[PDB]
Amino acid sequence: KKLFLVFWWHMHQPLYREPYTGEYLLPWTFFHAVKDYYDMPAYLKDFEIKLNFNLTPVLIDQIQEYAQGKAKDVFLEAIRKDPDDLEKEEVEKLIEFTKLNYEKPIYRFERIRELMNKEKLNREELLDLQTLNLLAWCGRTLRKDLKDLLNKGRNYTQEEKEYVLNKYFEIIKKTLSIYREIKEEGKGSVSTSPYYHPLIPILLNPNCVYETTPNVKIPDFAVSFREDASKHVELAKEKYFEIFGEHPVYMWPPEASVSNEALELYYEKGINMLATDEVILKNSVERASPYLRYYFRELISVFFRDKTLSDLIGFSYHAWNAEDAVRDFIGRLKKIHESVDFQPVVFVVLNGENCWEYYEENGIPFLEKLYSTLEKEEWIETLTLEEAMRKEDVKTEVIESVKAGTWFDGNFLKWIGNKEKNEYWKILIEAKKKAKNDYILVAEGSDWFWWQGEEKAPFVEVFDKLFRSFVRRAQE
């Protein structure tokens, strides 16, 4: 009797490319590409387990633009330049970026503490600030290859900085290839999401928010987003086809968000399986275990992730010693294994790139121990999404209805319902009446609503500039 374990790592960035200037206004796609988007699948080169990935189409677009040398990234330009060429504004940006990241374990360099305690930085000190910001985001592969430069920790030259930059772009250029490789070799399945990671249930029917939060105020949805919901799904199928040669049969619904209408739309667009959150299961069915394969109306297969296990990795284990965390995780799997006489399917689904910067050494000791341990446990069999979808020796159940929600408390309050987030929906509704191009789809991404009305910390103003620029461009 085995326990079936299914990792599904979700990779996404909203579009940071300002539509009028073409400038990438935040470097987050670059930094998570060099740190996580290649290295997370690259673990499969070293560990004989299965790991699955979701790539949003808008993230794929940006990875391609960087790989082709076409991404004009303003923060990266402040890193690349000789410090003598830095604008006062770029020095300010560098210092502000360092301050935002200063307390993260991946920024634990003594030299960074020295630099941030200095009243003024000369050219050598700025070169160190630039290069250490680069190296703080070094991924697992290059932490080995560049170990000597990493251990310097100080006294970097322009040539060394440029060497690191060149190796980083090599990683970006190999990124889509590694996803093709692990897919073709059967080491993992690759899914995608509707194109710009929107909240499909809201686009189809904004009143679905009242299934969980009856008291929420929402704006007057005087325009229909139902066709746009379809377009996000259809365009994602086309992008994922361009990159892999086939249409996707698995999708990750953004924010785990489902509703009866959304599940119908995914079924109508030929999606065979998705996953969502355990809270949605608990809200939809009186008594239901998350270790079964569910069939929604016999139309589409649904797995509900183990929320506890997913949250342990995504939010808890950064605060643990790596050995203890793996012991805890394996011990929890052992209890699931012993708690049923059938073979449970355990979905661990979370963002694949955001938690590691808070782990010691970028989560590498944790993941190397986890994967090394899992590959040796005879009673655990990790599965691709395809294997999980088709496994015969599992328990299944038909469900007829779900209560609309997301993996944030089973509801939509992170994206709608307060004055500021509702203002964004009002802006989008009015812009949709006059829309002329697909930039209206960009503006439908969940990220813009996530940051709005929170507020409040460096760069939220950048997300607001992007959202409003996309809204403006959509009407031309």
Ligand SMILES: OC[C@H]1O[C@H](O[C@H]2[C@H](O)[C@@H](O)[C@@H](O[C@H]3[C@H](O)[C@@H](O)[C@@H](O[C@H]4[C@H](O)[C@@H](O)[C@@H](O[C@H]5[C@H](O)[C@@H](O)[C@@H](O[C@H]6[C@H](O)[C@@H](O)[C@@H](O)O[C@@H]6CO)O[C@@H]5CO)O[C@@H]4CO)O[C@@H]3CO)O[C@@H]2CO)[C@H](O)[C@@H](O)[C@@H]1O
């Ligand atoms: O000043 C605030 C903040 O600033 C910086 O953060 C910046 C960040 O470092 C940078 O990379 C970027 O963030 C990106 C991010 O990298 C992308 O992946 C993307 O994030 C979205 C993600 O793809 C989505 O799946 C979604 O994930 C969220 C959920 O929406 C949340 O509800 C929550 O979900 C969990 C939930 O809490 C739990 O109950 C659990 O059951 O499971 C859920 C999932 O595990 O968290 C996840 C992850 O955040 O939404 C994401 C946001 O839309 O796009 C991001 C940008 O839109 O930009 C950040 C701001 O500049 C700084 O580094 C931070 O340290 C600081 O905290």
